[PDB]
Amino acid sequence: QTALTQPASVSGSPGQSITVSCTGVSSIVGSYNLVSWYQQHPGKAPKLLTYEVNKRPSGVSDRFSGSKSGNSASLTISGLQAEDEADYYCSSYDGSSTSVVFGGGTKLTVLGQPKAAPSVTLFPPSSEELQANKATLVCLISDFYPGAVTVAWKADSSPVKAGVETTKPSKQSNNKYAASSYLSLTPEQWKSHRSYSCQVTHEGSTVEKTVAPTAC
Amino acid sequence: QTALTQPASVSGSPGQSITVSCTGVSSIVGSYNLVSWYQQHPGKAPKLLTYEVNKRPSGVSDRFSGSKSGNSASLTISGLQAEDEADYYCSSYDGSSTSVVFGGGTKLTVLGQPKAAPSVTLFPPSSEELQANKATLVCLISDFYPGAVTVAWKADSSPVKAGVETTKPSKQSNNKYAASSYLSLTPEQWKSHRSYSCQVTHEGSTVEKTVAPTA
Description:
Chain A is mainly beta. Chain A has helices spanning about 125-130, 185-190; strands at about 10, 15-25, 35-40, 45-50, 65-70, 70-80, 85-90, 100, 105-110, 120-125, 135-145, 150-155, 160, 165, 170, 175-185, 195-200, 205-210. In chain A, the strands form four sheets. In chain A, strands 1, 3, 4, 7, 8 and 9 form a six-stranded mixed beta sheet that branches. In chain A, strands 10, 11, 14, 15 and 16 form a five-stranded antiparallel beta sheet that branches.
């Protein structure tokens, strides 16, 4: 399909500025100046950042500013924040003349954020779950960056080879990542060991938590 | 509140037809017939399916059809196939901003197995944690399909809205989804109430689990 031309990807560190270009904006018929920019976070609708080249909707940060020169338009994001990681699109044209044409999208990554080791919280099966003749351990992994981790489980000190499901890391509201790993056991297996452990490895460093059956 | 509104999620089986609707097209100034539908697969730009209500650009299969009736516009997909599983956004031209405005999007699942309500398991803060002056609650939500849920927490009888995080559902080894919602509180806060509750809504039906301090 036809699109306005953007770079495919851009990247910068917190506090920096990123300028995203968009070529092909000139309207054929007439001389329209109807260029807009949108921000799209994963799984959410695009949000309008600027319109009519350099107007901003209320609510939108003045960190976002639009410009145009001839057949090129530009979005400048100043004072970059981790939350700005998203895809950005330009658009141009009336609607009915040809229509509106969108850019191909630019993916923005914010590099140079600080290393954040994971917090690891380990939960044993509750007495309530054991009343249902089942047992689940949950290893909550939170506040880490970058967003990649590997999880291993042990029964006493031996590797667990079955019953483990680990979720794909998701970026949360503080721009750090979270994931959970859960291990489904029978109450026998649970009671048949002195302890179980969750080992989380992030950026070559391992964090480990252990938990054991209980009385009261 | 959002110029254009569509259902959060819908599902249909292979072969059948499904319609997704957006309301508010008539209230947008100068929208005329400039209503479009977009399909978006993860990691990809949105693909235009229909424009000028019912026109399809090249490449787009005639299984997709757009219509409009008053303040509502709809996308109908016939002979649903697997590849149609995606997010779908309606949009309209918006004379007030000389820009396009989008609906909130609809996650469409093409059912590849029967629906399955979530298993929900709720855990109280562990002893180790309290000792370290923290009190996280975790509401584990697993084996659900389609992969869409909504989570609300209750302190005692009062809904809660602070210290809550929920991960994006991820597909697990049995092709169903799992996510976890954790509520981060102080031991005091934990201590103060006789109950906390985790309420998961999936496919219009809400499931609840409750936990109470040890003892």
